[PDB]
Design a protein around this ligand. Sequence first.
Ligand code: TC9
Ligand code: TC9
Lengths: 205, 205, 205, 205, 205
Amino acid sequence: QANLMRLKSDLFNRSPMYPGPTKDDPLTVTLGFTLQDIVKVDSSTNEVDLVYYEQQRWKLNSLMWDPNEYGNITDFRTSAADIWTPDITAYSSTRPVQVLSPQIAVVTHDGSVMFIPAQRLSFMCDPTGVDSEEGVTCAVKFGSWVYSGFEIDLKTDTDQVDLSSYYASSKYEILSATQTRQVQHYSCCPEPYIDVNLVVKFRER
Amino acid sequence: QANLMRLKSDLFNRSPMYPGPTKDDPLTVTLGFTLQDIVKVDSSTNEVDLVYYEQQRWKLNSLMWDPNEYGNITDFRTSAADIWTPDITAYSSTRPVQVLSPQIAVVTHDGSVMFIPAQRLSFMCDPTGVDSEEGVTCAVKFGSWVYSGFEIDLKTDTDQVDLSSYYASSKYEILSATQTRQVQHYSCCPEPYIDVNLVVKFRER
Amino acid sequence: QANLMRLKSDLFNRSPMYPGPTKDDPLTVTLGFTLQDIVKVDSSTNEVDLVYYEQQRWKLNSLMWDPNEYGNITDFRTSAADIWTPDITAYSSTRPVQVLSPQIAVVTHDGSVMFIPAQRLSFMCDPTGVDSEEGVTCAVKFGSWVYSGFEIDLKTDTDQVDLSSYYASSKYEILSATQTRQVQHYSCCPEPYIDVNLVVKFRER
Amino acid sequence: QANLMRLKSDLFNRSPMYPGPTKDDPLTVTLGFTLQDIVKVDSSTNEVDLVYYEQQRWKLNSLMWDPNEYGNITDFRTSAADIWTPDITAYSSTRPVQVLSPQIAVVTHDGSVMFIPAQRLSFMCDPTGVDSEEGVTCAVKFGSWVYSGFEIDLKTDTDQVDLSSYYASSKYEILSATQTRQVQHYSCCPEPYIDVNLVVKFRER
Amino acid sequence: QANLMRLKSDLFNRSPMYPGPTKDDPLTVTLGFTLQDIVKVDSSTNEVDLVYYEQQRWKLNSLMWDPNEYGNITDFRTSAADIWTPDITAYSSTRPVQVLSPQIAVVTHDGSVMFIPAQRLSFMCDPTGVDSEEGVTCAVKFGSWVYSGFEIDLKTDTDQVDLSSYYASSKYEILSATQTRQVQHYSCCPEPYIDVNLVVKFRER
Ligand SMILES: COc1cc2c3cc1Oc1cc(ccc1O)C[C@@H]1c4c(cc(OC)c(O)c4Oc4ccc(cc4)C[C@@H]3[N@@H+](C)CC2)CC[N+]1(C)C
Ligand SMILES: COc1cc2c3cc1Oc1cc(ccc1O)C[C@@H]1c4c(cc(OC)c(O)c4Oc4ccc(cc4)C[C@@H]3[N@H+](C)CC2)CC[N+]1(C)C
């Protein structure tokens, strides 16, 4: 534990925290979703509740170290509060997202960070037709709240949502689930905006 | 990165925080709304729930810098906790407002700040007649809680609520949505009080 | 800005915070209610929900200053957390009160403080008869939780609750609303206790 | 206020906080309940909600002073965060307890502390028979979560629950309410455990 | 009080907090569940709510002392905030866990820690058949959120859940409850992953 304490002190206590990305030093965040359950549909307010894991990854020069200088530590776990993290947010939630897991990240000696919060999210969806063979389609966009594509770029590893852990006995079965990078341009500004579109088709039985 | 780190230290770590405006140093806050959805109407209690983005802009001389002195940085993002923010509040909410987005501001080198919190708001409105073709009109005033017009002035860029992001499968159809600056006068004191009246006429799908 | 920052620095950063009143240096807190809406009535549990502004005023010697020494500043606004506040409490709530407004107060150069929190309160009341013409009466007492009348006295400026802001389209119509200072003797204790009794008579409109 | 400021500084800003009791230096906490209302009875989940004031009293040598040294001050009010407090817990709650009063205590010159949190508690009870002339009996135990009776001894001043403030128009009549110190033997541990059994008999209307 | 104050200062105020385990300095956490009550069952969302006490035990060399040096103190109670605690998490919750007990742990002179948070948990569970003689079986896995079996190994003293405290009058009767260590291996990586599977069979009473 002596070496890890030294490393953390060197990384965190010995310099001002990373002030986030800028156009001159942009960063790429990879997003991936693991859908666990569709827990609730409300057809009187058009709200649907999902439970999922959101995998985020990024890399910072300021979090790099040489394992040989620290007893060959190649990675460590630490509170998310200890590091900068991206402001990735649902764009059409209807209630504050509910965090279901400890806020702890894994940092690797190449400066890469992996952070996987589990969340319950209520978002806007008209669920009518959910009780049919065809099912229904809902969508919610995820992206930075304040950084344009010039500061934060988003990427997915695959366009397919991970369904391997979807609750087998859910009230709702998943027909398809995709996660797709998009580039928007608002008629006010020249910079691109990026989001990842979570599109889920599902039905009752 | 080095220059941004130095700039924030100069802006935030060297002086005390802006103590807010006064009659001698008044401020103008620009407000605007982007209505995403009407998520609930409760006819038993006369409450209606909105989800919206709330644009706020103002400008502080104490947040100014010369880009040439800081590696040509022209603006930056920072936690809204790092800066003074106006106490803009709904005048007829029935529940604490729920914040749906990160609290992060954009600061520009001219001292301008832009802050766009997304919110779920419950407020007083009698929805009677919402299920007619003529619909129903509700209204909520927004303004400073403790500053009069001598200290904080309000403006809208436009009197038209931004509806271009309105949920396309909402239970409710928006007939009109305006945001209008108003000068109030309580028969207690001379100084004027300013508010922005959000007025929304809508009906069931 | 400079003068104000200097004033606050002098009032808040140079001496320990005011530790609250004692018998030898008692304080008077003036209370007043602006009733905005009766939002909910629950006959299953005998709970009624009110939304109101609670106006509080008191005066501290330690908050005085000479405007001439501070650029003619005669008053200022500041976070409620910067100052001592009375522990004024509803005595028969059934849920934690919910705060609907920013916790900011106005401080004046003679040491007077004005604080007006907006709140939603659930309290004990049997609504039986609310649907009639006579309506129903409910009452709730407000006062310090831990200070006796030897340390904090209360008073009202008028025993008439301010209804000039009551929601015109409430489900309930106010027939009467009074706020009355009471002096209580508790058999446990030789000190006088003071409360303000908010009595509201109302019916379905 | 000068004298009170000195006293708090001497009591609080000189030594570490009291680290809580040990077998070598045990502490006795006195508990007393004032039942204000049985708010809710859920027959579908067997949950009952009470509102009560839980009076806690204990005494510490480290909180003692001589009034002659501090301007005849014999007691003072202070934030509960300023002092050690016992971890008295309801043992079969089903939701986190909700605090309804300010977290402030009264400290007296003999080192005695009195802290009276008003709370709303949901707990496990089968309300079958509540709608009979005989009513139903429910019980809830209170005591330290982590201290044995070797470290914290509990007592009541009376076995009779204070019903003098019970809400006159509750949906429920109280047939009886008692609070009884129990010495408990757990087979895990040779040390005695102590709890206070709150037993309430009640019926509809 | 003096000796304990010394001990806490020596354990907590001299060195940095334990930074958590690593592959070189792994840690075993022992878990044991005491099931108090199955409180809710929702067949429209497939969620079930449990109240239980989760015993957690582990041992750090950095928490050891010689009782002879500290007045024979053999163990002490302290806020869970003063120490490192393992990130043990339910893998299929549908809402943030609710904490029902004080966050206070017991530390023993051999460096061992015992911490027993009482909690209400909502987790994914199809209750179909709960209203039958055979009842239904649900399960939820517990483990570290970010540590693999190389860093945190889990174990149970027994595979039988503690039922000695189950609410006698619950709406649901417990047919069986087991808690068993399991070793997973996720396709991506080679390190073992460890969880404790809590399996409850139950029926309406
Ligand atoms: C639904 O569409 C939007 C999606 C998103 C945003 C904003 C969107 O559209 C809006 C954009 C604006 C207000 C309200 C909006 O609803 C701000 C916009 C604007 C101004 C100055 C700028 O600086 C010079 C600037 O860049 C601006 O444009 C953006 C500001 C923030 C964001 C995007 C664009 C991120 C912002 N956030 C949550 C991410 C997703 C002044 C006023 N003006 C309205 C023109
Ligand atoms: C690791 O598990 C426990 C941890 C702790 C305790 C008890 C625990 O589990 C037990 C709980 C019980 C017996 C044996 C136990 O081993 C009592 C339990 C019970 C009854 C009545 C209650 O009131 C009407 C009640 O609240 C009960 O549950 C608790 C009682 C005390 C404590 C917790 C729960 C605190 C008690 N102690 C000091 C703190 C930590 C009667 C029937 N029943 C046996 C089911």
